[PDB]
């Protein structure tokens, strides 16, 4: 049949691995057919199976990582791969809370002397 990532979403971990195994077995047979003569139909199935394996593996990896993110959600420390990447320099910049910190002296100035809305008559 046609392997679609949509169908693999609901499948369990065990049967996802089993599907991966059957595809890997089939690809090995196709590679045998490549060197043992082999019809054009068998050769052209190599790409179909190869991409089918990638489709199954992507679903497994995507499922496995999102489970980690749910487990590590709310934890103080998370694995580096599960952390925001962005750029090294953006990761090393002050956080929004630190950037919004004001000294009491600065807070007192803003309270006492706020910028006023005014107009001047010509």
């Amino acid at each position: 049949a046609k392997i679609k990532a949509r169908d693999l979403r609901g499948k369990k971990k065990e049967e996802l691995l089993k599907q991966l195994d059957d595809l890997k077995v089939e690809l090995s047979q196709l590679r045998v057919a490549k060197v043992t003569g082999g019809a054009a139909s068998k050769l052209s199935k190599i790409r179909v199976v190869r991409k089918s394996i990638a489709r199954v593996l992507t679903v497994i990896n995507q499922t496995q990582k999102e489970n980690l993110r749910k487990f590590y959600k709310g934890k103080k420390y998370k694995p580096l791969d599960l952390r925001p990447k962005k750029t090294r320099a953006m990761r090393r910049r002050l956080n929004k809370h630190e950037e919004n910190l004001k000294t009491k002296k600065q807070q007192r100035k803003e309270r006492l002397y706020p910028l006023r809305k005014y107009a001047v008559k010509a």
């Binding site: 002397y113 005014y118 107009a119 001047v120 008559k121």
Partner: protein, 155 residues
């Protein structure tokens, strides 16, 4: 080599001048960019004057220019003290303050003191809370008269 009658010239072209030549092909683009920034700033700060805060009258120094006056950096602390304006408040309401300037003569001090008072009459002060006004300009005054004063404030 000189030839017949001519001026003795010493052109300052013995360094690698060709490496440091500033052309002005972005001058039209620079003028456009400055104009747009001026317009953007004016829209942001409306209805406050576009040019900026009011500046004082100062007399230009040296014998070459002491007959002329111009806009100064900011009103001195003595001028603000006589006018009755707190130095911290002056900046919020659009008055430039220059703590470095000292008034040597009373004529200059009175000229700027009068300038500050006349500015204060012309000022329309919007309340911080539109619903609740305390010591701000009248609703009628704010509603119609307020408009962005283009050009230097009280040239």
């Amino acid at each position: 080599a000189p030839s017949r009658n001519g001026m003795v010239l010493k052109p300052h072209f013995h360094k690698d001048w060709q490496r440091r030549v500033a052309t002005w092909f972005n001058q039209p683009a620079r003028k456009i960019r400055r104009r747009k920034a001026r317009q953007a700033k004016a829209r942001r700060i409306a209805p406050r004057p576009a040019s900026g805060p009011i500046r004082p009258i100062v007399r230009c120094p040296t014998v070459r220019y002491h007959t002329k006056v111009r806009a100064g950096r900011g009103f001195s602390l003595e001028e603000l003290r006589v006018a009755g304006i707190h130095k911290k408040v002056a900046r919020t309401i659009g008055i430039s303050v220059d703590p470095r300037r000292r008034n040597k003569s009373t004529e200059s001090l009175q000229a700027n003191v009068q300038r500050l008072k006349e500015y204060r009459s012309k000022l329309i002060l919007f309340p911080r809370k539109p619903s609740a006004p305390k010591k701000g300009d009248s609703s009628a005054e704010e509603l119609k008269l307020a408009t962005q004063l283009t050009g230097p404030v009280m040239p």
